[PDB]
DNA sequence: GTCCAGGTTCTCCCTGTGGTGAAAACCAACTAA
């Protein structure tokens, strides 16, 4: 199923609100075309590592431990969902 | 009456460093995964605890990026982050080759 | 079927140093998955300590070296001495 | 016929984490071929010291913000408050936590 | 055996020459008290992990594969000496 | 005759990015390990391929540090590295807690 | 005693694509230790693929997934198809 | 100093989560060699 224009779903306040959690007061208007780029790099290195686990067990559902196993691979461990 | 610039901003920093809420909303982040997954294998399903395993891992990366971005902006005698900071934030950690 | 866990054995530690304290469901799973991860770091470094010294045997010496590697500084001083109490108490029994 | 009283090996060492369950997770995890009888004793103690040390610190942050139960925010905040607990989990995201409250003291208002 | 004043053995040109390999043209005079600090942090996290291997086999010589096993642990693999 | 500042310096960058030699010498780095090893266990021996396993790993870290230091110095509109750069280089990677 | 190695099997690959080329001693040990490291990454990810799917068996399917994880991009396209030739040639024999 | 804005505390009602009590299931420990 194909639904495009959804890198533009990461809206303009929801990058500002993520900026405020990092402790950032004033931002530019050109982070919005940088953040959406660095985000899709990070999801093209997790979903590419997650699907090769789900294809390997011949599952059609990328389950909760799969993503945690992908994040185990990169060296960014996620607790709380298992694994 | 009229706030100065940097007053409503600093109210946001102590606000969002206290809550645990979702900042990136669900459905405009769930559909982002339905773009990258289409290349590697079409017709995949996702458990909602696995999408949420990404919504709490992508927000675990940008906040880890912006807090390491804002070190650079302060470092150049500024208080404003710029996209020359992020592209030099990532080159130091090795998060982009 | 059966999912083994460490959830029950947290309440037997939570009610040791904070006896008037509950713990939520989604915070149990962190201390659940803290255990399973810190399990296989210590085991999976004691495992690779067996090949490095050509033995097929995980002793209770090899778990001690695979805790002085993973734990840094002041945890490596306590969690060693918090194990050798529980072994010397164990072996004097039975 | 009957047999003696089955005394568990977790009660023969004064621990709370089991040793019977740990000793079949060293022979079904392919860590090595032989696993000593004292090794899952010694490992269930180190699993028990470190399970206290988070929950000791997770009890305080629950108390300092007037809570009965420990939600993951406290586990998020008990970690990264202690220094040596943070250096163990320096790479590790905890789910549903957010970060510590932090300002670099240059963004303070003028 | 005790030989002190040997964090001062990392001399002033030999930090400049390491700076030139990184592609650095102009340096300050206050890197020299920073580099010797960051260096001894890195050798108090390798020798502390190397000696626990050599003590474990009850060897008195920290051999070549020991250090490589310590650098295996941190996630900085060293080829060329074995392991 | 008289070189300008930045000319003999740039001769060094293309020089040392070509060779494979040892920059930190052997004996003033071998004795550095005879200070840190004395704490954890006195009277240890070292194989010379293990000291060299450190002399090619410590030089593998500073060069990885200074090349990520010099990104910051260029980032603050400068060409000079400073010890506020390194202490902010290491905080981004997480190499110091 | 005996140190097993991959040094001999480099000359049987070096003399395949550069037949007029020698190789030094201290550069052999890199391509020696390149192999032993890239061995246990692929094995040690196929190993942990056995536990994740509850099988005691390393098949030749599990080595294929533990090469599509470690090798990035265009090496993951060739080294898969440079293995399935050497298996289909192998199984049609014997 | 002064006025107000957005916040923090206190209380009351409501819900969801947790801590537990009871059966089943399975593993751990004991026994004989
Ligand atoms: Mg008989």
UniProtKB/Swiss-Prot annotation, chains A, E:
Signal sequence, renumbered to the chain: none
Record-listed cross-link Glycyl lysine isopeptide (Lys-Gly) (interchain with G-Cter in UFM1), residues: 12
Assigned GO CC terms: CENP-A containing nucleosome; chromosome, telomeric region; extracellular exosome; extracellular region; membrane; nucleoplasm; nucleosome; nucleus
Annotated localization: Nucleus; Chromosome
Residues modified to N6-acetyllysine: 12, 72
N6,N6-dimethyllysine carried by residues: 1
Residues bearing the modification Phosphothreonine: 61
Keyword line: Acetylation, Chromosomal rearrangement, Chromosome, Citrullination, Disease variant, DNA-binding, Hydroxylation, Intellectual disability, Isopeptide bond, Methylation, Nucleosome core, Nucleus, Phosphoprotein, Ubl conjugation
Modification N6-succinyllysine, positions: 12, 58, 60, 72
PTM annotation (N6,N6,N6-trimethyllysine): residues: 1
UniProt family annotation: Belongs to the histone H4 family.
Role summary: Core component of nucleosome. Nucleosomes wrap and compact DNA into chromatin, limiting DNA accessibility to the cellular machineries which require DNA as a template. Histones thereby play a central role in transcription regulation, DNA repair, DNA replication and chromosomal stability. DNA accessibility is regulated via a complex set of post-translational modifications of histones, also called histone code, and nucleosome remodeling.
Protein name: Histone H4
Gene source species: Homo sapiens (Human)
Swiss-Prot record, chains B, F:
Modification sites for N6-lactoyllysine: 18, 41
Keywords: Acetylation, ADP-ribosylation, Chromosome, Citrullination, Disease variant, DNA-binding, Hydroxylation, Intellectual disability, Lipoprotein, Methylation, Nucleosome core, Nucleus, Phosphoprotein, Ubl conjugation
Any one GO cellular component localisation term in the record: nucleoplasm
One annotated GO molecular function: nucleosomal DNA binding
N6-(2-hydroxyisobutyryl)lysine sites (modified residues): 18, 26, 41, 84
Impact upon substituting residue 39 to N: In BRYLIB1; uncertain significance
Impact reported for residue 4 to K: Reduced binding of histone H1 to histone H3.3-containing nucleosomes
Residue list for modification Phosphoserine: 19, 48
UniProt modification remark: Acetylation is generally linked to gene activation. Acetylation at Lys-84 (H3K122ac) by EP300/p300 plays a central role in chromatin structure: localizes at the surface of the histone octamer and stimulates transcription, possibly by promoting nucleosome instability. H3R2me2a is present at the 3' of genes regardless of their transcription state and is enriched on inactive promoters, while it is absent on active promoters.
Residues modified as N6-(beta-hydroxybutyryl)lysine: 18, 41, 84
Modified residues (N6-acetyllysine): 18, 41, 77, 84
N6-glutaryllysine modifications at: 18, 41, 77, 84
Post-translational modification Phosphotyrosine, affected residues: 3
Residues with the N6,N6-dimethyllysine modification: 41
Chain positions found as N6-crotonyllysine: 18
Subcellular location(s) of the protein: Nucleus; Chromosome
Phosphothreonine PTM sites in chain numbering: 42, 69
Domain of life: Eukaryota
Modified residues (N6,N6,N6-trimethyllysine): 18, 41
Modified residues (N6-succinyllysine): 18, 41, 84
GO terms of biological process kind: cell population proliferation; embryo implantation; male gonad development; multicellular organism growth; muscle cell differentiation; negative regulation of chromosome condensation; nucleosome assembly; nucleus organization
Effect caused by changing residue 90 to C: In BRYLIB1; uncertain significance
Designated name of the protein: Histone H3.3
Gene coding for it: H3-3A
From Swiss-Prot, chains C, G:
Cross-link Glycyl lysine isopeptide (Lys-Gly) (interchain with G-Cter in ubiquitin) placement: 3, 89
Residues bearing PTM Phosphothreonine: 84
Residues modified as Omega-N-methylarginine: 55, 61
PTM section of the record: Monoubiquitination at Lys-3 (H2BK34Ub) by the MSL1/MSL2 dimer is required for histone H3 'Lys-4' (H3K4me) and 'Lys-79' (H3K79me) methylation and transcription activation at specific gene loci, such as HOXA9 and MEIS1 loci. Similarly, monoubiquitination at Lys-89 (H2BK120Ub) by the RNF20/40 complex gives a specific tag for epigenetic transcriptional activation and is also prerequisite for histone H3 'Lys-4' and 'Lys-79' methylation. It also functions cooperatively with the FACT dimer to stimulate elongation by RNA polymerase II. Phosphorylation at Ser-5 (H2BS36ph) by AMPK in response to stress promotes transcription.
MF annotations from Gene Ontology: DNA binding; identical protein binding; protein heterodimerization activity; structural constituent of chromatin
Residues the record lists as N6-methylated lysine modifications: 85
Modified residues (N6-crotonyllysine): 3
Modified residues (Phosphoserine): 5
Record has GTP-binding as a keyword: no
Modification N6-(beta-hydroxybutyryl)lysine occurs at: 3, 54, 85, 89
Chief location bin: nucleus
Locations listed in the record: Nucleus; Chromosome
Modified residues (N6-glutaryllysine): 3, 12, 15, 77, 85, 89
PTM sites of type N6-lactoyllysine: 12, 54, 77, 85, 89
Modification type N6,N6,N6-trimethyllysine: residues: 54
One GO process term, biological-process aspect: antimicrobial humoral immune response mediated by antimicrobial peptide
Modified residues annotated as N6-malonyllysine in this record: 85
Residues bearing PTM N6-succinyllysine: 3, 85, 89
Positions of post-translational PolyADP-ribosyl glutamic acid modification: 4
Signal peptide (residue range): none
Residues modified to N6,N6-dimethyllysine: 26
Family from the record: Belongs to the histone H2B family.
Protein name: Histone H2B type 1-C/E/F/G/I
Organism: Homo sapiens
Origin organism lineage: Eukaryota, Metazoa, Chordata, Craniata, Vertebrata
Shown residues within the full chain: 33 to 126 of 126
Curated annotation (Swiss-Prot), chain D:
Listed Basic residues bias regions: 1-10
Modified-residue entries (N6-crotonyllysine), positions: 28, 110
Modified residues (N6-(2-hydroxyisobutyryl)lysine): 1, 28, 66-67, 87, 110
GO biological process entries: heterochromatin formation
Known outcome of mutating residue 48 to A: No effect on interaction with VRK1
Any one of the GO CC terms: nucleosome
Residues in cross-link Glycyl lysine isopeptide (Lys-Gly) (interchain with G-Cter in ubiquitin): 5, 7
PTM annotation (N6-succinyllysine): residues: 1, 87
N6-(beta-hydroxybutyryl)lysine modifications at: 1, 5, 28, 87, 110
Modification after translation: It is involved in the initiation of both imprinted and random X inactivation. Ubiquitinated H2A is enriched in inactive X chromosome chromatin. Ubiquitination of H2A functions downstream of methylation of 'Lys-27' of histone H3 (H3K27me). H2AK119Ub by RNF2/RING2 can also be induced by ultraviolet and may be involved in DNA repair. Glutamine methylation at Gln-96 (H2AQ104me) by FBL is specifically dedicated to polymerase I. It is present at 35S ribosomal DNA locus and impairs binding of the FACT complex.
Alphabetical keyword list: Acetylation, Chromosome, Citrullination, DNA-binding, Hydroxylation, Isopeptide bond, Methylation, Nucleosome core, Nucleus, Phosphoprotein, Ubl conjugation
Modified positions (N5-methylglutamine) in chain numbering: 96
Recorded consequence of changing residue 56 to A: Decreased interaction with VRK1
Predominant location category: nucleus
Presence of the UniProt keyword DNA-binding in the record: yes
The name this protein goes by in its record: Histone H2A type 1
Species of provenance: Homo sapiens (Human)
Gene name in the database record: H2AC11
